[PDB]
Design a protein around this motif. Structure first.
Motif, PDB file in Angstrom:
ATOM      1  N   UNK A  13      -4.594 -23.271  -1.639  1.00 16.45           N
ATOM      2  CA  UNK A  13      -3.431 -23.140  -2.518  1.00 16.45           C
ATOM      3  C   UNK A  13      -2.684 -21.830  -2.307  1.00 16.45           C
ATOM      4  N   UNK A  14      -1.425 -21.835  -2.738  1.00 14.79           N
ATOM      5  CA  UNK A  14      -0.602 -20.638  -2.662  1.00 14.79           C
ATOM      6  C   UNK A  14      -1.041 -19.622  -3.710  1.00 14.79           C
ATOM      7  N   UNK A  15      -0.949 -18.341  -3.356  1.00 13.04           N
ATOM      8  CA  UNK A  15      -1.302 -17.256  -4.258  1.00 13.04           C
ATOM      9  C   UNK A  15      -0.189 -16.219  -4.270  1.00 13.04           C
ATOM     10  N   UNK A  16      -0.017 -15.569  -5.416  1.00 14.34           N
ATOM     11  CA  UNK A  16       1.007 -14.547  -5.576  1.00 14.34           C
ATOM     12  C   UNK A  16       0.468 -13.192  -5.139  1.00 14.34           C
ATOM     13  N   UNK A  17       1.290 -12.447  -4.402  1.00 10.44           N
ATOM     14  CA  UNK A  17       0.915 -11.142  -3.877  1.00 10.44           C
ATOM     15  C   UNK A  17       1.992 -10.133  -4.242  1.00 10.44           C
ATOM     16  N   UNK A  18       1.573  -8.993  -4.785  1.00 11.76           N
ATOM     17  CA  UNK A  18       2.470  -7.912  -5.170  1.00 11.76           C
ATOM     18  C   UNK A  18       2.257  -6.727  -4.239  1.00 11.76           C
ATOM     19  N   UNK A  19       3.358  -6.142  -3.769  1.00 16.07           N
ATOM     20  CA  UNK A  19       3.276  -5.000  -2.861  1.00 16.07           C
ATOM     21  C   UNK A  19       4.593  -4.243  -2.898  1.00 16.07           C
ATOM     22  N   UNK A  20       4.529  -2.956  -3.229  1.00 17.53           N
ATOM     23  CA  UNK A  20       5.678  -2.052  -3.181  1.00 17.53           C
ATOM     24  C   UNK A  20       6.911  -2.679  -3.832  1.00 17.53           C
ATOM     25  N   UNK A  21       6.754  -3.051  -5.101  1.00 15.30           N
ATOM     26  CA  UNK A  21       7.848  -3.624  -5.883  1.00 15.30           C
ATOM     27  C   UNK A  21       8.459  -4.829  -5.169  1.00 15.30           C
ATOM     28  N   UNK A  22       7.594  -5.672  -4.610  1.00 14.72           N
ATOM     29  CA  UNK A  22       8.029  -6.870  -3.908  1.00 14.72           C
ATOM     30  C   UNK A  22       6.954  -7.935  -4.057  1.00 14.72           C
ATOM     31  N   UNK A  92      -8.180  -4.170  -8.543  1.00 17.47           N
ATOM     32  CA  UNK A  92      -7.588  -4.260  -7.212  1.00 17.47           C
ATOM     33  C   UNK A  92      -7.776  -2.926  -6.502  1.00 17.47           C
ATOM     34  N   UNK A  93      -8.737  -2.877  -5.584  1.00  9.35           N
ATOM     35  CA  UNK A  93      -8.992  -1.690  -4.781  1.00  9.35           C
ATOM     36  C   UNK A  93      -8.222  -1.692  -3.466  1.00  9.35           C
ATOM     37  N   UNK A  94      -7.395  -2.706  -3.223  1.00 12.14           N
ATOM     38  CA  UNK A  94      -6.657  -2.846  -1.976  1.00 12.14           C
ATOM     39  C   UNK A  94      -5.164  -2.692  -2.229  1.00 12.14           C
ATOM     40  N   UNK A  95      -4.494  -1.982  -1.326  1.00 10.74           N
ATOM     41  CA  UNK A  95      -3.054  -1.770  -1.378  1.00 10.74           C
ATOM     42  C   UNK A  95      -2.406  -2.483  -0.200  1.00 10.74           C
ATOM     43  N   UNK A  96      -1.318  -3.198  -0.472  1.00 10.54           N
ATOM     44  CA  UNK A  96      -0.628  -4.010   0.516  1.00 10.54           C
ATOM     45  C   UNK A  96       0.770  -3.456   0.766  1.00 10.54           C
ATOM     46  N   UNK A  97       1.230  -3.578   2.009  1.00  6.73           N
ATOM     47  CA  UNK A  97       2.574  -3.138   2.371  1.00  6.73           C
ATOM     48  C   UNK A  97       3.094  -3.999   3.511  1.00  6.73           C
ATOM     49  N   UNK A  98       4.276  -4.581   3.329  1.00  2.00           N
ATOM     50  CA  UNK A  98       4.873  -5.477   4.309  1.00  2.00           C
ATOM     51  C   UNK A  98       6.107  -4.830   4.924  1.00  2.00           C
ATOM     52  N   UNK A  99       6.304  -5.053   6.222  1.00  3.11           N
ATOM     53  CA  UNK A  99       7.462  -4.505   6.914  1.00  3.11           C
ATOM     54  C   UNK A  99       7.921  -5.463   8.005  1.00  3.11           C
ATOM     55  N   UNK A 100       9.234  -5.524   8.210  1.00  5.23           N
ATOM     56  CA  UNK A 100       9.841  -6.308   9.278  1.00  5.23           C
ATOM     57  C   UNK A 100      10.370  -5.363  10.347  1.00  5.23           C
ATOM     58  N   UNK A 101      10.084  -5.670  11.612  1.00  2.00           N
ATOM     59  CA  UNK A 101      10.549  -4.832  12.712  1.00  2.00           C
ATOM     60  C   UNK A 101      11.743  -5.500  13.384  1.00  2.00           C
ATOM     61  N   UNK A 103      11.534  -9.634  14.148  1.00  2.00           N
ATOM     62  CA  UNK A 103      11.423 -10.960  13.557  1.00  2.00           C
ATOM     63  C   UNK A 103      10.036 -11.264  13.013  1.00  2.00           C
ATOM     64  N   UNK A 104       9.072 -10.360  13.161  1.00  2.00           N
ATOM     65  CA  UNK A 104       7.696 -10.589  12.748  1.00  2.00           C
ATOM     66  C   UNK A 104       7.321  -9.621  11.637  1.00  2.00           C
ATOM     67  N   UNK A 105       6.530 -10.103  10.684  1.00  3.41           N
ATOM     68  CA  UNK A 105       6.112  -9.312   9.537  1.00  3.41           C
ATOM     69  C   UNK A 105       4.759  -8.671   9.813  1.00  3.41           C
ATOM     70  N   UNK A 106       4.687  -7.359   9.614  1.00  7.74           N
ATOM     71  CA  UNK A 106       3.436  -6.617   9.663  1.00  7.74           C
ATOM     72  C   UNK A 106       3.006  -6.366   8.226  1.00  7.74           C
ATOM     73  N   UNK A 107       1.848  -6.905   7.859  1.00 12.06           N
ATOM     74  CA  UNK A 107       1.289  -6.767   6.519  1.00 12.06           C
ATOM     75  C   UNK A 107       0.039  -5.903   6.626  1.00 12.06           C
ATOM     76  N   UNK A 108       0.132  -4.665   6.152  1.00 15.61           N
ATOM     77  CA  UNK A 108      -0.965  -3.713   6.211  1.00 15.61           C
ATOM     78  C   UNK A 108      -1.692  -3.704   4.875  1.00 15.61           C
ATOM     79  N   UNK A 119      -8.781  -0.410   7.036  1.00 17.21           N
ATOM     80  CA  UNK A 119      -7.426  -0.879   7.291  1.00 17.21           C
ATOM     81  C   UNK A 119      -7.459  -2.221   8.009  1.00 17.21           C
ATOM     82  N   UNK A 120      -6.446  -3.045   7.748  1.00 15.04           N
ATOM     83  CA  UNK A 120      -6.253  -4.259   8.535  1.00 15.04           C
ATOM     84  C   UNK A 120      -4.793  -4.677   8.477  1.00 15.04           C
ATOM     85  N   UNK A 121      -4.224  -5.001   9.636  1.00 19.35           N
ATOM     86  CA  UNK A 121      -2.817  -5.363   9.746  1.00 19.35           C
ATOM     87  C   UNK A 121      -2.687  -6.786  10.269  1.00 19.35           C
ATOM     88  N   UNK A 122      -1.940  -7.611   9.540  1.00 23.59           N
ATOM     89  CA  UNK A 122      -1.577  -8.950   9.989  1.00 23.59           C
ATOM     90  C   UNK A 122      -0.217  -8.881  10.674  1.00 23.59           C
TER      91      UNK A 122
END
Lengths: 228, 204, 164, 231, 29
Positions: A13-22, A92-101, A103-108, A119-122
């Protein structure tokens, strides 16, 4: 091996993710042999399927001092991610941050295990049209059709209840509580009232939270039926 | 009373022929069976409780040659003219009165009834289209009859446009067949069975 | 019988009437779509032009070949028409369709409006007569069970000898 | 601006079912004198096209030579040919449709008789961008699902009120006459449990997309209009 | 239902219309 990851991701199922006011909608399926991730923002969809070898190659470069096998790293990542995706307002001991370069999203994701950094980056590229369709469009259409069928069933039940109430009204007595009187149910009138009154708020997708909170069991059932 | 092709049998004449065939078959198969003929929608009326537009041509009684001749008097075009002159046609009606008249006819007889069956010969899928209260009264009366233990069946006849049971008659029949919810552009297949005369005595 | 409707809605006496002309069917003379609205004392017409027609059709997500008469008739039936009158301009809002439509109208010249008013009155009288005549004419003038014998299976017809 | 109006019109239009020689598609077309915009899909991929008067004229000249028509007339004739098919199917069309799925692109060929003479056109629909695909399919579908869930909740509340009224009638010294007209209490959990195992397998079958166009178009149009008004 | 009539009432468009009202009733054409 590879197919099992796709099936698991489909059956999740889909899950909601919050990161840097997004906000984001995430589907993740992690096993000892790799993982599959699908992240959407209601405008674009990114997908990432990863095997053990690349997991080790990326982990050794992200965490230089970490000496772990791919299976242990994947298990730790799953244990870290699943509690957050399942529900919010938790430790929540994990912090998430998404960025676009381009066309691909890097999710750290950065956290601490036993007090030590982790650390782990998708690196998720844009999802293919087939994957996006199979994961969002067809399940959503099936859910809409199922909800319409449910509405029809509810209308029929309301008609039967109205017939019983009319039986009492025509041959019976009067209610002791006059405040409980209910008007006859008309499908067209109800639909018109709904459309002109509550549709603007009902159809407010927002940032994807109502989609996750309200109807997810129906989505899972529709996806499972599609699989079979 | 209208023939689409100008050569095929009219619905009324075909219904009369089916009734005659059933009477003839009963005269041999079982002499101790009760048959009745009631017409609804006529100008005249005759009933024990005296509703309007309901004519009971023949009450529940054992079949005989006199009843067959009475039906034969309306056999053809001259018979149709005689029926129109003596009874009339083209009048408003309510199904509730017809069903209650049928129930009264059933209750009038005293011999123990093993079966109680009603046959509706009509080509009007939606009789009470303009009105709605009459339709609801018809549904209530049909439900009361079904609960009482009376089995109602419809023999839809030719319809120039098309006969549909999903409009009003879906909830009127006792038991619905496996495949009967479609639109019937032809006459009911049970008409052939009814017209197939059987000359043989069967003992219970 | 071109679509038309009168405002304000309700049992109150009428104070405004709107109708549409043009887009005649068939291979005969065809005129551009236009709307005529009158209080019986002043008349407002669209004064549309082909460029204006194209702009209006494209503005509300309507194709160039799309016909607006059915929408106007449907809205008139539903009485979903609203009006806002300015010093020399009028704005008409239609909500009979899925999307609201806005129309702008300007006062027609008096010398040209008077013949239009006379033609409208004559047409209204003709329609009244025709519809009154029509109303006067119309308003008044178990499987395998024998049906014959329940409880006994329907015996098949006797065939006889049928060589293979 | 003309492109913006074309995009808005395409967004406003509802989905329609098109039956080609062998396959079926869901299509939305918006044609104006300045050009047209088309969006086709088959529940697996989405293709989009948008052309202006100049492209229309060039394509008309290159496909059907010996025809000298302005782009506006060609667009009007294309609309006259297409709109009746989308509005209703299984009716006299005399307009053959075919599709060719070339590498990373689609060609939709339409053939017709214009006053007894050949009239050919081709839509060169490339893969639709994720943004347009999302805006046209995903968000409207989620909005429709949320609206239907709200409708189900409202109907459940109405059923609860009717059950309360029936309970009041029963407790007010009443005696039901027709026992058959006896509705059992309504429970949301029980109803959902029965539905998910009895009707979901048959009620969640999109098939070729015909049910979607036949059932959920008014809601789709309303949701799209609301989204456009919001932003 | 105030009575009224048109001339010509046939296929040709009517030219004049006659009616009565307020039975100071006066026939208005």
């Amino acid at each position: 091996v590879m197919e099992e990851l796709e099936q698991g991701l489909l059956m999740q199922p889909w899950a909601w993710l919050q990161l840097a006011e997004n906000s984001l909608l995430a589907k993740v399926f992690i096993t000892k042999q790799g993982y599959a991730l699908l992240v959407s923002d209601l405008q674009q969809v990114w997908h990432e399927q990863v095997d053990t070898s690349v997991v080790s190659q990326r982990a050794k470069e992200l965490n230089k001092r970490l000496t772990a096998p791919p299976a242990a790293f994947l298990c730790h990542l799953d244990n870290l991610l699943r509690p957050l995706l399942k529900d919010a307002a938790h430790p929540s001991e994990a912090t998430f941050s998404c960025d676009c370069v381009a066309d691909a999203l890097i999710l750290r994701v950065r956290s601490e295990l036993s007090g030590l950094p982790f650390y782990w980056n998708f690196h998720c590229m844009l999802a293919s049209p087939s994957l996006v369709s199979q994961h969002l469009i067809r399940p959503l259409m099936g859910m809409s059709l199922a909800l319409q069928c449910q509405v029809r069933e509810l209308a029929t039940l309301l008609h039967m209840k109205d017939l019983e109430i009319q039986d009492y009204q025509e041959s019976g007595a009067t209610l002791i509580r006059d405040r409980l009187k209910t008007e006859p149910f008309e499908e067209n009138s109800f639909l018109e009232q709904f459309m002109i009154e509550k549709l603007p708020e009902a159809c407010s997708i927002g940032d994807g939270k109502p989609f996750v909170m309200n109807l997810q069991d129906l989505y899972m059932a529709v996806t499972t039926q599609e699989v079979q | 009373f209208e023939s689409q092709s100008e050569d095929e049998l009219t619905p009324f004449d075909m219904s009369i022929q089916c009734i005659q065939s059933v009477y003839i078959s009963k005269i041999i198969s079982s002499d101790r069976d009760l048959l009745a003929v009631v017409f609804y929608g006529t100008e005249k009326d005759k009933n024990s409780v005296n509703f309007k537009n309901i004519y009971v041509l023949q009450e529940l009684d054992n079949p005989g040659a006199k009843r067959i001749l009475e039906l034969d008097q309306f056999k053809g075009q001259q018979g149709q003219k005689r029926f129109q002159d003596m009874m009339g046609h083209g009048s408003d009606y309510s199904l509730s009165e017809v069903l209650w008249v049928c129930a009264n006819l059933f209750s009038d007889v005293q011999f123990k009834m093993s079966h109680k069956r009603i046959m509706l010969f009509t080509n009007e899928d939606n009789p009470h289209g303009n009105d709605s209260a009459k339709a609801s009264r018809a549904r209530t009366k049909a439900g009361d009859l079904r609960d009482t233990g009376i089995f109602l069946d419809l023999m839809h006849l030719k319809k120039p446009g098309g006969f549909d049971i999903s409009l009003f008659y879906r909830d009127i029949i006792s038991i619905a067949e496996d495949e009967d919810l479609r639109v019937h552009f032809e006459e009911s297949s049970k008409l052939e069975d009814l017209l197939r005369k059987v000359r043989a005595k069967e003992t219970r | 019988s071109p679509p038309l409707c009168t405002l304000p809605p309700g049992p109150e006496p009428p104070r405004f009437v709107c109708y549409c002309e043009g887009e005649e069917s068939g291979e005969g003379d065809r005129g551009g779509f236009n709307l005529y609205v009158t209080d019986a004392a002043e008349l407002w017409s669209t004064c549309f032009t082909p460029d204006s027609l194209a702009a209006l059709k494209a503005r509300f997500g309507l194709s160039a070949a799309e016909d607006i008469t059915p929408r106007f008739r449907a809205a008139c039936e539903q009485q979903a028409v609203a009006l806002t009158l300015q010093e020399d301009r009028a704005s008409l809002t239609l909500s009979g369709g899925p999307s609201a439509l806005a129309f702008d109208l300007s006062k027609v010249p008096g010398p040209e409006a008077a013949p239009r008013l006379r033609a409208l009155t004559l047409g209204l009288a003709k329609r009244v007569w025709s519809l009154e005549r029509r109303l006067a004419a119309a308003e008044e003038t178990c499987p395998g069970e024998s049906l014959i014998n329940p409880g006994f299976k329907s015996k098949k017809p006797a065939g006889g000898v049928d060589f293979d």
